[PDB]
Amino acid sequence: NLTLNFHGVLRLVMELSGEMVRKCDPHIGLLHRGTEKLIEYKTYLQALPYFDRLDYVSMMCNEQAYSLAV
Amino acid sequence: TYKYVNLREPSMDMKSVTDRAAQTLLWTELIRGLGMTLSYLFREPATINYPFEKGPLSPRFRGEHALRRYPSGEERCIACKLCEAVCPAQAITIEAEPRADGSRRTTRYDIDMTKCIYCGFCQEACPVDAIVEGPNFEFSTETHEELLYNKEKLLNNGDKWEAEIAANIQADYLYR
Amino acid sequence: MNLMLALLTNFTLATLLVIIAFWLPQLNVYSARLPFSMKFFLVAITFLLFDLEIALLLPLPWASQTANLNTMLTMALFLIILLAVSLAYEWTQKGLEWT
Amino acid sequence: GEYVVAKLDDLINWARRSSLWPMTFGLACCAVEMMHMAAPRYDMDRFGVVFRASPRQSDVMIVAGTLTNKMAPALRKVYDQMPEPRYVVSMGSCANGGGYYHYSYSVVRGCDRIVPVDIYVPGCPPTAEALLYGILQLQKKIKREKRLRIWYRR
Amino acid sequence: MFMINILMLIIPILLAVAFLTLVERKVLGYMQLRKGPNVVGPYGLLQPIADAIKLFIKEPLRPATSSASMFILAPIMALGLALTMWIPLPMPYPLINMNLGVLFMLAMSSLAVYSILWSGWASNSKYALIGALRAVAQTISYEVTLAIILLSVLLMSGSFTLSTLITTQEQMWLILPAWPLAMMWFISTLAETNRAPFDLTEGESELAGPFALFFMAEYANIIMMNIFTAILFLGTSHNPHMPELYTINFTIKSLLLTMSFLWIRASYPRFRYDQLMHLLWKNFLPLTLALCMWHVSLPILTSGIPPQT
Amino acid sequence: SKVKQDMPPVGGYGPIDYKRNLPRRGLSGYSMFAVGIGALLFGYW
Amino acid sequence: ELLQVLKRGLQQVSGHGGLRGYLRVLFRANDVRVGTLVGEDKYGNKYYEDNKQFFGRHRWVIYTTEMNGKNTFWDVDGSMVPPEWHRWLHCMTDDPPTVKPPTARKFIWTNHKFNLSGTPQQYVPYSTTRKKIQEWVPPSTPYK
Numbered sequence A: 001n002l003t004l005n006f007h008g009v010l011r012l013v014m015e016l017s018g019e020m021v022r023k024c025d026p027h028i029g030l031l032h033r034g035t036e037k038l039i040e041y042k043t044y045l046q047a048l049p050y051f052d053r054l055d056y057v058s059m060m061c062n063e064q065a066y067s068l069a070v
Numbered sequence B: 001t002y003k004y005v006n007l008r009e010p011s012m013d014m015k016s017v018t019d020r021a022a023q024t025l026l027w028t029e030l031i032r033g034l035g036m037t038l039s040y041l042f043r044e045p046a047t048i049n050y051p052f053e054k055g056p057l058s059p060r061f062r063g064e065h066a067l068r069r070y071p072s073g074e075e076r077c078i079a080c081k082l083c084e085a086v087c088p089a090q091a092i093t094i095e096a097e098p099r100a101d102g103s104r105r106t107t108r109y110d111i112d113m114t115k116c117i118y119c120g121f122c123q124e125a126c127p128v129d130a131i132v133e134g135p136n137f138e139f140s141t142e143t144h145e146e147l148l149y150n151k152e153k154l155l156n157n158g159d160k161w162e163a164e165i166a167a168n169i170q171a172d173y174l175y176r
Numbered sequence C: 001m002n003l004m005l006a007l008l009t010n011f012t013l014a015t016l017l018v019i020i021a022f023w024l025p026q027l028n029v030y031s032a033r034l035p036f037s038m039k040f041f042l043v044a045i046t047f048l049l050f051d052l053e054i055a056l057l058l059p060l061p062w063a064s065q066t067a068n069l070n071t072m073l074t075m076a077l078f079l080i081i082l083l084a085v086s087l088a089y090e091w092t093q094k095g096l097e098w099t
Numbered sequence D: 001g002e003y004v005v006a007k008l009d010d011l012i013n014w015a016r017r018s019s020l021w022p023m024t025f026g027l028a029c030c031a032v033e034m035m036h037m038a039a040p041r042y043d044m045d046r047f048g049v050v051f052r053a054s055p056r057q058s059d060v061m062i063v064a065g066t067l068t069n070k071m072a073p074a075l076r077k078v079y080d081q082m083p084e085p086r087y088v089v090s091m092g093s094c095a096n097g098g099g100y101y102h103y104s105y106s107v108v109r110g111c112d113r114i115v116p117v118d119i120y121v122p123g124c125p126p127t128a129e130a131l132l133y134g135i136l137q138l139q140k141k142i143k144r145e146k147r148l149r150i151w152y153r154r
Numbered sequence E: 001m002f003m004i005n006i007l008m009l010i011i012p013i014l015l016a017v018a019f020l021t022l023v024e025r026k027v028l029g030y031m032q033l034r035k036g037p038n039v040v041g042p043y044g045l046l047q048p049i050a051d052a053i054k055l056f057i058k059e060p061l062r063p064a065t066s067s068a069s070m071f072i073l074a075p076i077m078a079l080g081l082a083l084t085m086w087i088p089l090p091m092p093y094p095l096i097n098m099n100l101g102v103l104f105m106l107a108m109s110s111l112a113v114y115s116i117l118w119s120g121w122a123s124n125s126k127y128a129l130i131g132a133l134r135a136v137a138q139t140i141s142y143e144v145t146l147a148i149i150l151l152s153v154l155l156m157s158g159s160f161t162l163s164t165l166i167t168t169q170e171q172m173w174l175i176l177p178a179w180p181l182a183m184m185w186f187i188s189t190l191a192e193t194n195r196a197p198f199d200l201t202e203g204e205s206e207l208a209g210p211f212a213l214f215f216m217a218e219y220a221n222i223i224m225m226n227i228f229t230a231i232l233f234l235g236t237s238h239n240p241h242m243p244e245l246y247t248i249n250f251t252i253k254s255l256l257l258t259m260s261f262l263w264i265r266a267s268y269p270r271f272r273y274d275q276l277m278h279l280l281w282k283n284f285l286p287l288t289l290a291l292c293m294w295h296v297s298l299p300i301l302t303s304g305i306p307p308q309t
Numbered sequence F: 001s002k003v004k005q006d007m008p009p010v011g012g013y014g015p016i017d018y019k020r021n022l023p024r025r026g027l028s029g030y031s032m033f034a035v036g037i038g039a040l041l042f043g044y045w
Numbered sequence G: 001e002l003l004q005v006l007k008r009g010l011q012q013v014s015g016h017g018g019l020r021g022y023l024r025v026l027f028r029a030n031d032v033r034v035g036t037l038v039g040e041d042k043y044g045n046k047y048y049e050d051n052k053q054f055f056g057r058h059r060w061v062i063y064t065t066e067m068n069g070k071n072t073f074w075d076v077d078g079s080m081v082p083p084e085w086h087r088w089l090h091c092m093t094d095d096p097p098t099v100k101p102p103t104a105r106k107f108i109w110t111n112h113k114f115n116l117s118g119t120p121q122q123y124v125p126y127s128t129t130r131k132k133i134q135e136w137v138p139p140s141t142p143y144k
């Protein structure tokens, strides 16, 4: 079992036997920026721009989801 | 309503089987792919000749900030602090006092351009069109400190860019 | 002679480029078993055995000048066919799978 | 002795700024605008900027996105492995000074706490054209270097 | 006079490689709806010079190498071997006229895998050695088909002399009687030089001066494979009183084949490692063995055995 | 003055294609093999 | 049409006023297209358009060789475009400042400045407010 230590940035800890993948362990949090906590210090309008920056490929869809909830 | 993207049975008659055999051995789909990249070779490229040519922008473009004046030269900003209150990044810092002529005016107006998210909420909140995001976007710096704007910097941007800023506001204010 | 000079020049130039590539101003004043599959050993060994028989096929362009073409053609095909049997054996014994 | 040194600076400065190979830390949103600067409209390759290079062959690091505390040691490790000369371009508000997450418990307030930065590109995100202006500005900065002139006055 | 001649081969090869890097970036650019280098010199003509100067004054970062001797040997071996592959090429006259020139080229290219092996041993890293062992396993596998395909073609030529391939193709290109072999030959060169869609050293690793020398060797080999493909399958007619007419036609074919490497790189995704091994061991090799059998029999049954000399 | 707003043209926009269009080209497998064998035979002769 | 293509290429040399002018724009702007001279600003930048070109390449500027005392023969910069032409060059409008001049104000900069970062003219931040706490100043005459 050979262990290998390696959109954004991802850390994959993998175990291989020859060519095969026995286990994939994604280690995330490399882009955790406490957005959910920051939103608690914003008004509802002030929080809206945070949703552009989640799935920052689908900005207005994220805006739409937040708007519908509000 | 739905459709199947990949639910088909290949025809198993000899002509169809030989067609697939010919594709496998003679690489026909791969040759077809080469035709597509060849066709692009002879297409005019989409590249523009920056900085001699520029990407199109609209009057609404949110760029570098600036503080504006009335035609007389009086500042438009009256230190209401609505911009500072709405700023999602807390990138605006304001102090004010009665000016020597009794006017309501700021003594500090800082924008930390490295906190700012260029959202334009400040120019929406301003009741007198004092703070705007201008059309400039070519103001990168060699140091961090150069991006911590004070009132002097922002007033100069207003005096520097007013000719364009006034024209852009003219083009879009009926949408606001 | 000409061949030895050509060889000397090629590797001498490669040596000079390499040592020059390593030395330039700068201006600065301040024995085990690899965790690697048995499958890759078999690829190397299979290459070796197939390579040895290609060594025996290399003389075929000259052998076709023979007056004994019955024998030459039979032996040439016999060899290539045995080469194919070797591949079919590797193949059917799962010597070519990577899983 | 002094004419030669000035011309030799010009040559090596020209070669380095004409052949700027970037390693992109595509950390977040700003990486999308970096991809657009590689895309046909701007085509960074036409300036001699290769689309992607490994760190060991890289001349410039573009920090394109938020740098979290969890990610900071890795970013420093990559920077230390760059061969010199090496330059850092900080792209966008997050990398510039923390931006919209500046007050977060998990965010580095500016990538210049971790590595020395040569150019700061403002915006959230900067437009692909704004990044290209920043890259060209770095080229102008390299053009002003006088390494051999200072070497021979030592 | 001969040392002049050697230099008239070596220096142009390195120049051709330098400007192949420009041509690759521009061809790929235009197939991608962009332009590629066009600022550094007119139409990017100074881009190779800027890149070369930049690479050679870059900091030469040597990590702790396990074997200093093998750290220097591998690039010297790679560059020296690459240059050596050109000395028997008839353009239309070779620098050295070898009776067994085809075998010499076969013998020399089979040593090119040592520089991969020695660089993994010199990398002082387990993962770099493993990557080097995968590259070797790929290279030697496709050596198998190249050698057998080459032998099959020479059964129509009758000789190991490279200039005999010119005589053999006086009336007609060998691509016509041997296009199935040409197809697999061409794909084999791509996998042999570790080119896309067989660029698995770059793909797998993704998941200064010395670097430049390895790169020049690799690109010198890419041009040479395509020169060899042009001689083997698209033979240019040679007129002894106007040898430069051969060289121009010869050069154009070689350039077009070299650009087809570029064209192919722009068009396909990459193979999986096991998938390119299956392509060789389960597809090309069975068909090359059958076509080797066929090409031994065909001259005998048509009464078309070529002359020994 | 009358309200003026971004609106579609009277009658709407013209039709817009969206279905996959991958046109069929080339010969049948029989013909392709026939040409290849024919080329080989000419080369052999 | 291969001949007509070459004629147009030759016309570009004439369009740029000879071989020297042709080679100057080639080495300064890497582009030898001939366009209609829309206008020239007070700094010497010249502005061209060609509406046969696709959107994005239909407008361009040839930067002056000297601006505010700086040699810009080789060192051109996007910030060198003054605001009144900036709107037209980026297609925020269809009217160049020659046809629709900007409104004049007494406080608007008469002289545009380009990006001054990294020069002695660079911006340096500071607090614009006055001291808030005033210290007691002891008397200058002894009387302990």
Ligand SMILES: CCCCCCCCCCCCCCCCCC(=O)OC[C@H](COP(=O)(O)OCCN)OC(=O)CCCCCCCCCCCCCCCCC
Residues within 6 Å of the ligand: B024, B025, B026, B027, B030, B031, E180, E181, E182, E183, E184, E186, E187, E197, E229, E233, E264, E268, E279, E283, E284, E287, E294, F036, F037, F040
């Ligand atoms: C009269 C009697 C005569 C007797 C002799 C008769 C013989 C003639 C009839 C036989 C013709 C044989 C064809 C030889 C070509 C090799 C065919 C082949 O191996 O292709 C199959 C291979 C795998 O195919 P796949 O679909 O993935 O799976 C099948 C395996 N299970 O698929 C592939 O190899 C894919 C190719 C990979 C490379 C892709 C990148 C380049 C592709 C475009 C190249 C363009 C062509 C190059 C030409 C070069 C010219 C020098």
Ligand SMILES: CCCCCCCCCCCCO[C@@H]1O[C@H](CO)[C@@H](O[C@H]2O[C@H](CO)[C@@H](O)[C@H](O)[C@H]2O)[C@H](O)[C@H]1O
Residues within 6 Å of the ligand: C025, C026, C027, C028, D008, D011, D012, D084, D085, D147, E052, E053, E056, E057, E058, E059, E060
């Ligand atoms: C191929 C033809 C080339 C002809 C041109 C010949 C010009 C010779 C002058 C070369 C000048 C090199 O310039 C110098 O290069 C080295 C890289 O090795 C850089 O790096 C060097 O300096 C830094 C500190 O400054 C050190 O930490 C580093 O370890 C060192 O390698 C320098 O930052 C750069 O100043």
Ligand code: SF4
Residues within 6 Å of the ligand: B083, B086, B087, B088, B089, B090, B091, B092, B111, B115, B116, B117, B118, B119, B120, B121, B122, B123, B133
């Ligand atoms: S653009 Fe948004 S983040 Fe920037 S100063 Fe204005 S309100 Fe604050």
Ligand code: SF4
Residues within 6 Å of the ligand: B076, B077, B078, B079, B080, B081, B082, B083, B084, B094, B125, B126, B127, B128, B129, B130, B131
């Ligand atoms: S800029 Fe506008 S919103 Fe902000 S304090 Fe001044 S007047 Fe109020």
Ligand code: SF4
Residues within 6 Å of the ligand: A053, A056, D028, D029, D030, D031, D064, D065, D066, D091, D092, D093, D094, D095, D099, D100, D123, D124, D125, D126
């Ligand atoms: S600066 Fe703005 S666009 Fe860039 S990563 Fe941060 S939030 Fe996203």
